[PDB]
Amino acid sequence: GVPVLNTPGSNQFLTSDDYQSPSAMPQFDETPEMHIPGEVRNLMEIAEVDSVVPVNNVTGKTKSMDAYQIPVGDKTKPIFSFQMDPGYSSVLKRTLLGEMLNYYAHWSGSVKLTFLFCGSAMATGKLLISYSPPGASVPTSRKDAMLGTHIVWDIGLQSSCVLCVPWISQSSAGYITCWYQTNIVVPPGAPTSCDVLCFASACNDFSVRLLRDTPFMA
């Protein structure tokens, strides 16, 4: 019949191939597909969902829900500060963003952060959210944070300030520090100490290349 000749690679089993498998049950006709709500067609649709970031993950507050709460209410040291990279960072590694990025080796994109102030409706103050570029050093003072990139976030007007941090990739990252511009001003009835929740997702669109096994599972 047809003269064929087997190339190198015949009668082998490459694990990652896409050949036509001979079906064991050919007569069998499978169940018709109904419409089920909430289809996922791409993994990066999970990374685009905001989720609470455990910024206050200090040594004794990680098995409770005090990990998610940033205590607000000393103006010389910042409120919080963390590396801005969803991989290899204790704060952003178990986020929905940071967990769908540990399945991959090459990823690059931007990341948006939402700071929801969960204090009273009468508490009023200012917080200064500074961003350092990936090469720069952290601000040691509030003035040195003001001279860089910042957003003086008035709490009494808006209760949710949104960032969008670019240049986030791996294959020495940024910083999101936060400072007391003013103290929390509060009437006699409302409580003095408040909390700030944080969030993280993919800002506009996220690029991600090389799939691998996750490190968390043992």
């Binding site: 993994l43 990066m44 455990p54 040594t59 204790s90 704060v91 991959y104």
Partner: protein, 224 residues
């Protein structure tokens, strides 16, 4: 390593078929050829489920509902003769199982089986979407028996079958101990209802029980 300009724009590797559809070894087992005419060590079983090893199990728990064809390719070895021929019998969810290597179930016409002889390419058998419902359920917050009886969390919709494997050679002069490695692969996979990733380590292969684990790794202060 150093931080490079990782400049490209692609999410083709993040789709569901390019995330789940990867062949992984899910079942090693030994089975002899001779001796002990009534023994359970002359064939393999492996009830097919996604909750086999925790690395794959974790990926199937990203999503509540998913449907997919499976296309497994066995990799069969031998130790210690003639040329050996094997039999990999897939029984459906409604199917009789053998109790011994010489049971009559092995001859059932409704149980498809491949007869792979040694030396050739590995045997590949493909199984369609069997389930009664419209998708396989990774999680089932419900009770199998009505009125809150036993067996929490186990539905019969996500039953995929079993995979009985034996030598077809009746006997041998010496002992031959064959080893099989089943390579499971989802195919033509759809997935619904995303779900947060597993945090705690796995305890048992038929339940969701866990030990309370810390959220993230701890650091010294909030500002360092």
């Amino acid at each position: 390593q150093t931080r490079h300009v990782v400049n490209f724009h692609s999410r083709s590797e993040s789709t569901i078929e390019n995330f789940m559809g990867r062949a992984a070894c899910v079942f090693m087992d030994q089975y002899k050829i001779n001796g002990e005419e009534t023994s359970t060590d002359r064939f393999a079983v492996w009830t097919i489920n996604i909750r086999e090893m925790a690395q794959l199990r974790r990926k199937c728990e990203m999503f509540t509902y998913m449907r997919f064809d499976i296309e497994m390719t066995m990799v069969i070895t031998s130790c210690q003769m003639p040329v050996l021929t094997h039999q990999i019998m897939y029984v459906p969810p409604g199917g009789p199982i053998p109790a011994k290597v010489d049971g009559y179930e092995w001859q059932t016409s409704t149980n498809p089986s491949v007869f792979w002889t040694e030396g050739n390419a590995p045997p590949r058998i493909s199984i369609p979407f069997i389930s009664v419902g419209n998708a396989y359920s990774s999680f089932y917050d419900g009770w199998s028996h009505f009125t809150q009886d036993g067996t929490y969390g186990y539905t019969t919709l996500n039953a995929m079958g079993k995979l009985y494997i034996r030598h077809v050679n009746r006997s041998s002069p010496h002992q031959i101990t064959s080893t099989i490695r089943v390579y499971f692969k989802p195919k033509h996979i759809k997935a619904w209802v995303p779900r947060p990733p597993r945090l705690c380590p796995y305890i048992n292969k038929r339940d969701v029980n866990f030990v309370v684990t810390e959220i993230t790794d701890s650091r010294t202060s909030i500002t360092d």
